[PDB]
Symmetry: C2
Subunit: 208 residues, 2 copies
């Protein structure tokens, strides 16, 4: 019922894929190679000229976070009420903010900007540790008592940063335990260990 | 006091859209202004979730992130589409607006002089998506999504307003967006807000560039 149109990398589809997998949803991967993308056709047909492109039945969507929020809304991963929904958005936007800085590093300034990025990393991750500390002692989810699309997005954020800066979660016990706990969920655990995830590079330029 | 409180710097910036939304919806709110000098003191910043503003107060609910505030008000005031599918289209529009706003932000604050020519050159291709969406929704005679206004409309409206200042006549190539701006700006409550000192006497950005 779901189709993900994206390049052969984890990137901005990693979180939504983990969500679909953990939620026991099946989906088709429409892999677009760089060569195919360079042909120009598909790009021209995309709303903002970019991927991922997402299909849910007759509904076609663009924008990674829109897909996340759509799945969150339709699959019930958006908090229990409006207050929690606001909290879920606050976390996701925060994740998006850091991901954008991560993307800038990876794609435009890896060699000269990595040292400074890693130096400031602790200060960028602390907010999430604080949020967990204020919710059920950090024993459940980033918001409320049920998983939300923000959890999958934050999880990915944390996974890629552990690769960029190994041990960056050492000073944050709640985040560390959070990563292990979510990664241990049966279906997600299976996904993370599968070739579909493992044999895909994190980004499109070979940097991580 | 008022249930709504906006904590931000004395600029329109990332609070312009949510303010238009509140004003157009007949809502009142408190403006708690933070001067750069106060911000430099460090206390407030240290207390903010992500170390930045805006900070929004709704009763005892304290929020951060401009788009979280927009979505929150959109949810609470019924400005998020008529159903789940429209809500998704509303998000798609806002995320697009957010993407352009970040580029606009990069130009204004980190590379105005050297990047303006290319930014303006590339502007048309960046605005086209919104004109397209408009053309696919009742000939663009109503809103960006569906037949009722959404929080995305206020965000897109602001985006268009500041780009007309950045590049006068940029909407000449987009009749639907042009009429759209004139139409929404004409809404009684919004029109009054846009002409008021509360809005007019605040600069668009915080570094004097526009």
């Amino acid at each position: 019922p779901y189709t993900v149109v994206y390049f052969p990398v984890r990137g901005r589809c990693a979180a939504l894929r983990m969500l679909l997998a953990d939620q026991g949803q099946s989906w088709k991967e429409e892999v677009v190679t760089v060569e195919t993308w360079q042909e120009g056709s598909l790009k021209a047909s995309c709303l903002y000229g970019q991927l991922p492109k997402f299909q849910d039945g007759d509904l076609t969507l663009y924008q990674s976070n829109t897909i996340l929020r759509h799945l969150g809304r339709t699959l019930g991963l958006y908090g229990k009420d409006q207050q929690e929904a606001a909290l879920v958005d606050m976390v996701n936007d925060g994740v998006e903010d850091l991901r954008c800085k991560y993307i800038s590093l990876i794609y435009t300034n890896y060699e000269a900007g990595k040292d400074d990025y890693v130096k400031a990393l602790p200060g960028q991750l602390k907010p999430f540790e604080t949020l967990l500390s204020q919710n059920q002692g950090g024993k459940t989810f980033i918001v409320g008592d049920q998983i939300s699309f923000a959890d999958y997005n934050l999880l990915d954020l944390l996974l890629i940063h552990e690769v960029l800066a190994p041990g960056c979660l050492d000073a944050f016990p709640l985040l560390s335990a959070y990563v292990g706990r979510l990664s241990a969920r049966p279906k997600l655990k299976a996904f993370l260990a599968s070739p579909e995830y493992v044999n895909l590079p994190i980004n499109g330029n070979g940097k991580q």
